[PDB]
Design a protein around this ligand. Sequence first.
Ligand SMILES: Nc1ncnc2c1ncn2[C@@H]1O[C@H](COP(=O)(O)OP(=O)(O)OP(=O)(O)O)[C@@H](O)[C@H]1O
Length: 315
Amino acid sequence: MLRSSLLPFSYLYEKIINFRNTLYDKGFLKIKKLPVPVISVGNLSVGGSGKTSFVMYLADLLKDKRVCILSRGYKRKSKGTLIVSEYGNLKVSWEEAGDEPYLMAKLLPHVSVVASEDRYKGGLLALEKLSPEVFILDDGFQHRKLHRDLNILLLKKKDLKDRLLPAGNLREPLKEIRRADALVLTYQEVEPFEFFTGKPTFKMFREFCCLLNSDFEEVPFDILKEREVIAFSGLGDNGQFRKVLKNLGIKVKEFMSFPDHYDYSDFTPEEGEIYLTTPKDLIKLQGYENVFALNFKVKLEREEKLKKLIYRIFY
Ligand SMILES: Nc1ncnc2c1ncn2[C@@H]1O[C@H](COP(=O)(O)OP(=O)(O)OP(=O)(O)O)[C@@H](O)[C@H]1O
């Protein structure tokens, strides 16, 4: 009965969140405008809702534009505004960038990535140094201080039954779905679901494509043919990763579980063996040419309307 014990904090947190949102709604707090288009990707949950996949998909749609991701870079022990990546060129290590913005830069070698708590300041720096044509906020639904021309909200079925922090995982009450210009329905593979709001709505799917090597280049799945791999990941990821490796038919001779906080500073792989791990782990192991991650293609069902919305923000 522990969870219900946190409900009083949830109701309190609701008042705090609703007040802030009301101030934004009614024009009491400033909303700043960058002089090029801004697309926000977001979610209502503190848990994952497929954002990295959707940013990959979104960047691919925008492959003919100069793209810059504006990330919070929340973890990082350093602060201020920081260029992590210039169109694929990493400017800092993962330690300094934080895991997540560094990983996004590796997953998207054609886009820039800027880490900045204040997204607007991030954009200004990018404008001066990188001359991008469009910004993507990878987690910007609540960052209402920055105007976005297209507000995309990711929603998984589980969100619809959740409750506010700290009793549940929601950062905001479900009514705030109203702020979205478009919904992307995620986690379809494990929990398929429909949701009608009248808003433009798109189901997202992932499909296995290839391995990623330690340099994050795409390499064929073929190399696993008649090989048994050693797989490893952080403590929590162990579950999802295992299930996925099995359903893909990947032969695993041994699995290893490390703590979620591992910098792999003591990791010693065996020459001649092939390793599979998560992209979040892979970033700490570049150079090891026998360590790979799985790469998935990202697709949106009936995407045409989404493309139209994106097209129209460049006027
Ligand atoms: N299309 C993809 N190909 C390869 N790796 C991916 C892809 N999309 C995401 N990843 C990596 O795999 C992890 C799991 O993906 P998934 O979307 O199931 O989890 P999530 O926690 O909802 O995602 P996120 O970390 O973006 O919030 C992500 O955290 C990211 O590191």
